[PDB]
Amino acid sequence: PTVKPPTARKFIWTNHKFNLSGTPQQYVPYSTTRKKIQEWVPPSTPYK
Amino acid sequence: KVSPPKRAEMKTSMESLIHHFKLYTEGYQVPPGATYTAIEAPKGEFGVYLV
């Protein structure tokens, strides 16, 4: 890379990170989608 | 209709993009039939009976 540096992009990490497994920085999977079914919320007033 | 187009053709030609799309989703159809085909594999005769 001294002779042929890589093409710069503004979204490329400026700071490389090594393998973070086993540490508090480890990746934890999760679902990236929002809740699919919306539940009816009952009224807050008494009327019955 | 069997082998996918080159990527540069896939990105310029309408027919190539269609065929790339279909080959990588449905895949090519194979005419009905059955074959036993064998080769001289390193361990001996290796064959498939493909229907």
Binding site: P29, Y30, S31, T33 | -
Partner: protein, 125 residues
């Protein structure tokens, strides 16, 4: 030498299926309806057997669709309704058969588009 066996064919005990997936299941024997998004009719030739849909739920870790139904993806193809019904009976599945729906023959006439006195006259082409 051939022997006479007069009972109905019932292989439920030698197929290895669990009991809950013989008596609780409902097989549907049908010809798939044409996908309305396309005009081709080649997916309406053969009969199909499918089973009732059971629960799918979200995986707590990833949100994937989990199932406990081993027959959820099982689809069988048959040449005729009779073949599908015979297969269901010998396996012990209760089934619903649905008649094949064939498109009705139509009277098409290009010349009707320009009728002298009828309503079939088109206003544009």
């Amino acid at each position: 030498q051939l022997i006479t066996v007069d009972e109905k064919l019932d292989i439920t005990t030698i197929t290895g299926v669990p009991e809950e997936h013989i008596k609780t299941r409902k097989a549907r024997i049908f010809v798939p309806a044409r996908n309305n998004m396309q005009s081709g009719v080649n997916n309406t030739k053969k009969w199909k057997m499918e089973f009732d849909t059971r629960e799918r739920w979200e995986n707590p870790l990833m949100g994937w669709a989990s199932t406990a139904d081993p027959l959820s993806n099982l689809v069988l193809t048959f040449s005729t309704k009779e073949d599908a019904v015979a297969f269901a009976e010998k396996n012990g599945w209760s089934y619903d058969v649905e008649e094949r729906k064939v498109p009705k023959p139509k009277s098409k006439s290009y010349g009707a588009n320009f009728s002298w006195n009828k309503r079939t006259r088109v206003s544009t082409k």
